[PDB]
Design a protein around this ligand. Structure first.
Ligand SMILES: [Ca+2]
Length: 223
C-alpha cells in the first residue's frame, strides 16, 4: 500500500497473509473454512496466516492453517486478468473472536464514489521498494466505470472496477495482490492489477466480487 497508514494490530480481522515460506499475497476470510483471494495468487503449498499484524514476529494472535484445496475461477484468464478470483479451503476451521473474523459478501454491487478500505503488506513505494512488516491501510473511493476505462483503454471488463486517486500517490501495490477492498462492511473487491503503483491516471484495478457471490456460495456448499 502506497500512501496509506498503519492499520493497527488486528483492526482488519478478515485480512489474511498467504505464506509459502514467505508472505506472497493477501486474502480475505469469508467463513471459518474459506478464504477469497486473487487467481493470480495461485500456487501449491499455501499456508494461510490469520490474526497477523507484524508478519515477521509472532505476536500472540496468529492462527497458521494449511490450505487443503485451492479453486481458481473456472473462467480465469491470466493474460487479461478477467475473473481474477480464487477460493482457498483451510484444513481446519479458524477460531473466530474479534481479532479473527470473517467479512460479509455483498448482497449488491457498490457504486462509484463509495468509500472503501484496502489493506495489505505490499510495497509502500511508488518508485523502488520497501515492504512493511505491519499491515497497511488505505481509504479510497470506487471510481466511475467511464474513468476506469479511460485510464485503461481496452482492458476493463465487467468483472473489474477501479478504485483510488487519479492524481497518483495512493494505491495498492505488489504484495497486496489478493487482499480486500471492503466498503460498508462488505467485501466488494480483490486487489488485482494496475500499471505500476500510485501513478498518475493509473488507478488500481480490482476484481468485482459482487459478480461472484453465486459462484462462491455454490462452491463452498459442495466443497
Ligand atoms: Ca505475526
Amino acid at each position: 500500500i502506497v500512501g496509506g497508514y498503519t492499520c493497527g494490530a488486528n483492526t482488519v480481522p478478515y485480512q489474511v497473509s498467504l505464506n509459502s515460506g514467505y508472505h506472497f499475497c493477501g486474502g480475505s476470510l469469508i467463513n471459518s473454512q474459506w478464504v477469497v483471494s486473487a487467481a493470480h495468487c495461485y500456487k501449491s503449498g499455501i499456508q494461510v496466516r490469520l490474526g497477523e499484524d507484524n508478519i515477521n514476529v509472532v505476536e500472540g494472535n496468529e492462527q497458521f492453517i494449511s490450505a487443503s484445496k485451492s479453486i481458481v475461477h473456472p473462467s480465469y484468464n491470466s493474460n487479461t486478468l478477467n475473473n481474477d478470483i480464487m477460493l482457498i479451503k483451510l484444513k481446519s476451521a479458524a477460531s473466530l473472536n474479534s481479532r479473527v473474523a470473517s467479512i460479509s459478501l455483498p448482497t449488491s454491487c457498490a457504486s462509484a464514489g463509495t468509500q472503501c478500505l484496502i489493506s495489505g503488506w505490499g510495497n509502500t513505494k511508488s518508485s523502488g521498494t520497501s515492504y512493511p512488516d505491519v499491515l497497511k491501510c488505505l481509504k479510497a473511493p470506487i471510481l466511475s466505470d467511464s474513468s476506469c476505462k479511460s485510464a485503461y483503454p481496452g482492458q476493463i471488463t465487467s468483472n473489474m472496477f477501479c478504485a483510488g486517486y487519479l492524481e497518483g500517490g495512493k494505491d495498492s501495490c505488489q504484495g497486496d495482490s489478493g487482499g480486500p477492498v471492503v466498503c460498508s462492511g462488505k467485501l466488494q473487491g480483490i486487489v488485482s492489477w494496475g500499471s505500476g503503483c500510485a501513478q498518475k491516471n493509473k488507478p488500481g484495478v480490482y476484481t468485482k466480487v459482487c459478480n461472484y457471490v453465486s459462484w462462491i456460495k455454490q462452491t463452498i456448499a459442495s466443497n
